[PDB]
């Protein structure tokens, strides 16, 4: 604080979000980045005993959830990837990639 910034302004930030576990059909577990898929976000919220309900992964059919996630992962061809200039701040990570899922949730 000095002659110019005489007050502390209101601080807000744009986070990228909590990392979630993305289950694959083969069996490997990928949890390194946040996912825009709604089902994975709900699964993270439902299997966390720190915040939310503590529903163990035992009480979940992995194959059905994996198959239903691909339904929300279907590529939409109505618009073009070039039409979104704020690509980085809508959840996308690489403009070259598809990033055209039917339903994307932030």
């Amino acid at each position: 604080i000095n002659e110019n910034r005489t007050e502390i302004p209101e601080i807000s930030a744009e986070v990228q979000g909590k990392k979630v576990k993305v289950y694959n059909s083969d069996g490997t577990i990928k949890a390194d980045k946040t996912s825009l898929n709604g089902i994975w976000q709900l699964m993270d919220y439902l299997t966390s005993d720190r915040y939310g309900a503590d529903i163990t992964l035992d009480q979940f059919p992995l194959q059905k959830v994996i198959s239903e996630a691909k339904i929300l992962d279907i590529i939409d061809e109505s618009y073009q990837t070039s039409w979104q200039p704020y690509w980085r701040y809508v959840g996308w990570n690489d403009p070259l990639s598809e990033n055209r899922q039917i339903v994307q949730l932030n």
Binding site: S12, V15, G17, K18, Y51, L105, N106
Partner: protein
Amino acid sequence: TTILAKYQVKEERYKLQSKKKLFGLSRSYSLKKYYETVTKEVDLDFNLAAKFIPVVYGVQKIPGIPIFADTELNNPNIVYVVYAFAEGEIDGFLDFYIGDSPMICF
């Protein structure tokens, strides 16, 4: 909050932006009521629900809840204030809004 209020404007002295602006329009609301309920800022001296830690999936803008604020001894105009953004292992911070202007311009 009380210590931080010393270094703020008379307004926004004890205030914080609402974590979620829009929440969803269903048959439980009407247009006028739904768009009148949406709030921008909440007072921290009588809203204990504003001190809960949110969880973010994807790229979203959230306010920071102060949890520590103190100045240096021999340099009292240098103030350290700690804001707790979001919950869990987040990917990172994309940008910071010092006031209403982000550090990385549009």
